[PDB]
Amino acid sequence: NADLAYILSMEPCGHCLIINNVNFCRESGLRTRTGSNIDCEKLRRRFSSLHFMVEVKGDLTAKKMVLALLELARQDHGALDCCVVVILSHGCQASHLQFPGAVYGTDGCPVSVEKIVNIFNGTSCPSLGGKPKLFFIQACGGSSLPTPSDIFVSYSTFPGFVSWRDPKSGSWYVETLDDIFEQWAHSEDLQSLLLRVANAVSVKGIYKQMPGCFNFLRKKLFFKTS
Amino acid sequence: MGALESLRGNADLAYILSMEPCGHCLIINNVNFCRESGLRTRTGSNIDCEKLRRRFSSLHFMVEVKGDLTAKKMVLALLELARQDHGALDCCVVVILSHGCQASHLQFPGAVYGTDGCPVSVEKIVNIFNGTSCPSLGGKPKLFFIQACGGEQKDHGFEVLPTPSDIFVSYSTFPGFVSWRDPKSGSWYVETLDDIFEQWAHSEDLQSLLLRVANAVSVKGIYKQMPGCFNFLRKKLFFKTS
């Protein structure tokens, strides 16, 4: 209350798009991301519980990924409270100007996180103005309000399967995140959940790459559950 | 023994700050830039500078302020800081007040200008405090508050292995945008942050505080500013208060 938390009253809570890239063309040389379907199913099932209208889309091209994203922003989120985008794919380690991060489309071409974030800013998507825009990225391999307000990105490149010898048992990250949400999303906010995830991950890999959060929200975000 | 209490106490959910003092705090305050620069005098930074000096002193840090430093001297000050022994400390704070801009980066956006008009990337600054370069802060929170233009765009808004660890970078403005300041009241961001840390540092964690700050600043001026941060922390952070 007192404008300390975003109001998620509406039912459904919002739209959620999951880009699941598994099969890449030969020219790129990017290995098949087998096990990502396990990941996709966990997340689809998850954000569904969080009362979102989840739409999955497999093996998308950089061009097609962008179109799907634009297609989402062209929507009327007017009576909705939040938007969610999840992308599973190989990560691109290009350096950037505004925001870090990129993910490979099936064609081998990258789509920077900065492009993705902006497709959802205030000008491009007035419909979501003042509402929280969440982006979850798992790169396995490879009055007025400010225009960029309410943008929140969780970026993970943590390799590691649930069963360490089996590259097809799924992502230890998604499973850990999914598990933590299942247990605390009912009483803890987004940033609090993600810290539990970040901690769990670090305990699993001392030096290994820890997930980061590019946080530009104005209030806490308590997901709608039960 | 309430919730917040049990929370503050859980070493798994919160960074435990038990040492006295807490650690080092370094404030770099550049106000007078060279002529060749074209950069303006950052009138009002000094009031921001002292507020923070006093603020972090309040939060049990050993504060050291260094003003008007060339890019080279900045790196030097930062190198010496990391070169120290933070073994009996629990946290490290670095504040930078100055002009800034976009810089090509891998993990951390933007850069900050030395008094000489030369740029120092935030990413280079954060990295000076990596686990190898400064094992004395391994696993401990290293905080960075950056008050500098994140870019050139004036936002009108609309009507309504070298990996970061325990790194937390609070940005005054969104990467790519302009950060606003007042000649006699200081920068929106710092004035807001000090005010908020005043009222809540005693009962709220670092991140919670900054949402308040981001929320407050977001309703300001004709031109808009959207504060935010790159959080690579593992736990919540509650400062040691008075």
Instruction: Kindly give, in sequence order, each residue whose CB lies less than 8 Å from that of residue B194, ignoring residues fewer than 6 positions away.
Output: B51, B52, B55
Resolution for the entry shown, Å: 2.8
Chain A interface includes B224 (CB < 8 A) = yes
Within 10 angstroms of residue A9's Cβ, the number of other Cβ atoms is 8
Report the CATH number of the B1-242 domain.
3.40.50.1460
Cα B214 from Cα A178, distance rounded (Å): 28
Q: Compute chain B's Rg from CA coordinates.
A: 17
Q: What is the DSSP string of B69-89?
A: --HHHHHHHHHHHHTS--TT-
SS3 A86: strand
DSSP B152: S
Instruction: Kindly give, in sequence order, each residue whose CB lies less than 8 Å from that of residue B72, ignoring residues fewer than 6 positions away.
Output: B114, B116, B118
Determine the topology of domain A1-226 in CATH: Rossmann fold (3.40.50)
**B203-215 b/e (C-beta count within 10 Å ≥ 16 → b):** ebbbbbbbbbbbb
Instruction: Kindly give, in sequence order, each residue whose CB lies less than 8 Å from that of residue A100, ignoring residues fewer than 6 positions away.
Output: A113, A155, A214, B105, B106, B107, B108, B109
Domain ranges within chain B, ordered by starting residue: 1-242
Query: With contacts defined as CB-CB under 8 Å, which chain A residues touch B219?
Result: 143, 145
- As to burial, measured by CB atoms within 10 angstroms (0-12 exposed, 13-18 middle, 19+ buried), residue A32 is exposed
Kindly determine whether residue B12 and residue A214, on different chains, have CB atoms separated by under 8 Å: no
User: Looking at B117-238, which runs of residues are DSSP E strands?
Assistant: 119-121, 142-147, 158-159, 167-171, 181-182, 186-187, 228-232, 236-237
Inter-residue contact A175 to A138 (CB < 8 Å) = no
Cα A74 from Cα A15, distance rounded (Å): 12
Name the experiment that determined this structure: X-ray
Kindly determine whether residue A145 and residue B165, on different chains, have CB atoms separated by under 8 Å: no
SS3 B57: helix
CA-based nearest residue to A89, from A68, A72, A66, A110: A110
Inter-residue contact B78 to B70 (CB < 8 Å) = no
In this structure, the strands spanning B167-171 and B228-232 are: antiparallel
Inter-residue contact B207 to B236 (CB < 8 Å) = yes
CA-based nearest residue to A91, from A158, A161, A175, A151: A158
Inter-residue contact B239 to A223 (CB < 8 Å) = no
CA-based nearest residue to B56, from B3, B95, B28, B111: B95
Cα B169 from Cα B175, distance rounded (Å): 12
Inter-residue contact B227 to A145 (CB < 8 Å) = no
Cα A104 from Cα B175, distance rounded (Å): 23
Measured on CA atoms in the order B124, B129, B135, B139, is the torsion positive or negative? negative
As annotated, the active-site residues of B are 99, 149
Query: With contacts defined as CB-CB under 8 Å, which chain B residues touch A3?
Result: 215
